[PDB]
Design an enzyme around this catalytic site. Structure first.
Site, short mmCIF file in Angstrom:
data_model
loop_
_atom_site.label_atom_id
_atom_site.label_comp_id
_atom_site.label_asym_id
_atom_site.label_seq_id
_atom_site.Cartn_x
_atom_site.Cartn_y
_atom_site.Cartn_z
N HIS A 1 -63.97 9.64 13.36
CA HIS A 1 -63.22 8.48 12.89
C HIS A 1 -62.79 7.51 14.00
O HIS A 1 -62.38 6.38 13.73
CB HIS A 1 -62.00 8.91 12.06
CG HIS A 1 -60.79 9.23 12.88
ND1 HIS A 1 -60.43 10.52 13.18
CD2 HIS A 1 -59.88 8.43 13.48
CE1 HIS A 1 -59.33 10.50 13.93
NE2 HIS A 1 -58.98 9.24 14.12
N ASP B 1 -64.89 15.65 10.75
CA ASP B 1 -64.49 14.56 11.64
C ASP B 1 -64.88 14.95 13.06
O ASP B 1 -64.03 15.36 13.87
CB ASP B 1 -62.98 14.36 11.51
CG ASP B 1 -62.47 13.02 12.21
OD1 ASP B 1 -63.31 12.21 12.66
OD2 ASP B 1 -61.24 12.82 12.26
N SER C 1 -56.39 11.27 18.68
CA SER C 1 -57.60 11.73 18.02
C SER C 1 -58.72 11.99 19.03
O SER C 1 -58.86 11.28 20.02
CB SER C 1 -58.04 10.71 16.97
OG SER C 1 -57.22 10.77 15.79
#
Ligand SMILES: *[C@H]1O[C@H](CO)[C@@H](O)[C@H](O)[C@H]1NC(C)=O
Ligand SMILES: [Ca+2]
Ligand code: NA
Ligand code: NA
Lengths: 118, 36, 259
Positions: C43, C99, C205
């Site tokens: 992402h 992800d 992330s």
């Protein structure tokens, strides 16, 4: 009606400087130069160890640096030393402000390439 | 090959390699102890 | 990282910073899994709804960093991306399931006191370490608070942040959100009654959730900071991409596209 200022009809991002009665040239502030593919626009340049980054005051901390430079403390663009860093040139490497010179051979004369590897 | 389990990974030069432990490393080790 | 603390020099030699060239800014974290491969979250690179789609030339991979802003000359190393490999079944449509993304570097990174790859778990490591109560570690240069509204904090850290968070049992993770949880994810963080807190946040992330093996003393990356709802809220837990579950795919692209 003599003489016409060509800049009156110009649409430059920063400034306009007349050449003839018909032609002009879009220019930029010191430390900036016209974008080759967008002559009416400006982009920052640097030929030293560091120069202040091009930051947009309409948005906090959004800064730009020319190719070969990376944002550093105090919102300053500092030169990337591709030679000391490694991986950019397999031959003889000479660092430059904004890019690097890579000498490739091992033949005679040796080719001096700018910004590219062997 | 990759993922064989023979590669030298997971050991920190400034820590395991020098027999030094970081500040909160013990906390993770102490979490392994299960209550019977 | 919310409720974390300053990482020590060389504490996470595998920690990678994905840096956007234009504008010059932190994009996400990542991890060094070999001298030519970097692991991150999908992402961070691709999200169609917001027209996000970063390519090889849009970023710089910065390894060996400590300070978030300083250009750590002769300490950190910049690597150019040869190819980005986003998981083909990455579910950006709903869950952000799978992800995960791999990045092959053009040239092999030089290992040093600040640069060194983390191990990826095998079957046994995953079974033994991935248990509720067991604490793992997350690192990153992301937001110190949920921000994006009113909040008292330093916003972004000056140095890499680190937090130790315990794995939470699956049913508790499941009941904490209305979002469907898959086996390709696990959640971590303290429960309200534990008092202690901490969590990953925006910008974290791609960073690794590592665990130190009590058996061989090596660090293993069990997860990738993937998602959450807010940051460090009571009854909420950070969700991570389960690395072992997707290890088959990791080994597949690395073997096919070379090491
Ligand atoms: C966007 O374009 C890149 C190539 O420039 C490609 O790798 C990627 O899959 C594309 N994704 C979308 C959502 O358009
Ligand atoms: Ca240079
Ligand atoms: Na200008
Ligand atoms: Na919490």
């Amino acid at each position: 009606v003599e003489p016409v200022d060509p800049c009156f009809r110009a649409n430059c991002e920063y400034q306009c400087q007349p050449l003839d009665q018909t032609s002009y040239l879009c220019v930029c502030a010191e430390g900036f130069a016209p974008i080759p593919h967008e002559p009416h626009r400006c982009q920052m340049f640097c030929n030293q160890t560091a120069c202040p980054a091009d930051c947009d005051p309409n948005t906090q901390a959004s800064c730009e640096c020319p190719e070969g430079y990376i944002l550093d403390d105090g919102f300053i663009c500092t030169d990337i030393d591709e030679c000391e860093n490694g991986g950019f040139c397999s031959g003889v490497c000479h660092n430059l402000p904004g890019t690097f010179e890579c000498i490739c051979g091992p033949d005679s004369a040796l080719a001096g390439q700018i910004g590219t590897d062997c | 090959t990759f993922g064989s389990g023979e590669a030298d990974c997971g050991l920190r030069p400034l820590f395991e390699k020098k027999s030094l432990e970081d500040k909160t490393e013990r906390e993770l080790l102490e979490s392994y102890i299960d209550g019977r | 990282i919310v409720e974390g603390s300053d990482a020590e020099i060389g504490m996470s030699p595998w920690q990678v910073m994905l840096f956007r060239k234009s504008p010059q800014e932190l994009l996400c974290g990542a991890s060094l899994i070999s001298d030519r491969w970097v692991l991150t979250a999908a992402h961070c690179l691709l999200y169609p709804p917001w027209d996000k789609n970063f390519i090889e030339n849009d970023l710089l991979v910065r390894i060996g960093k400590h300070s978030r802003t300083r250009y750590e000359r002769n300490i950190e190393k910049i690597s150019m991306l040869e190819k980005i490999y986003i998981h083909p079944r990455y579910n950006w449509r709903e869950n952000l399931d799978r992800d995960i993304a791999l990045m092959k570097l053009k040239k092999p990174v030089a290992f040093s006191d600040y640069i060194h790859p983390v191990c990826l778990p095998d079957r046994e490591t995953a079974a033994s370490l991935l248990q509720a109560g067991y604490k793992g570690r997350v690192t990153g240069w992301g937001n110190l608070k949920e921000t994006w509204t009113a909040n008292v904090g330093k916003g972004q850290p000056s140095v890499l942040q680190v937090v130790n968070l315990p794995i939470v049992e699956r049913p508790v993770c499941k009941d904490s959100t209305r979002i469907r949880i898959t086996d390709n994810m696990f959640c971590a963080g303290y429960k309200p009654d534990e008092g202690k807190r901490g969590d990953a946040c925006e910008g974290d992330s791609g960073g690794p959730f590592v665990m130190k093996s009590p058996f061989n003393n090596r660090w293993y990356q069990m997860g990738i900071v993937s998602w959450g709802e807010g940051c460090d809220r009571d009854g909420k837990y950070g969700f991570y991409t389960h690395v072992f579950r997707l290890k088959k795919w990791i080994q597949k692209v690395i073997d096919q596209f070379g090491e």
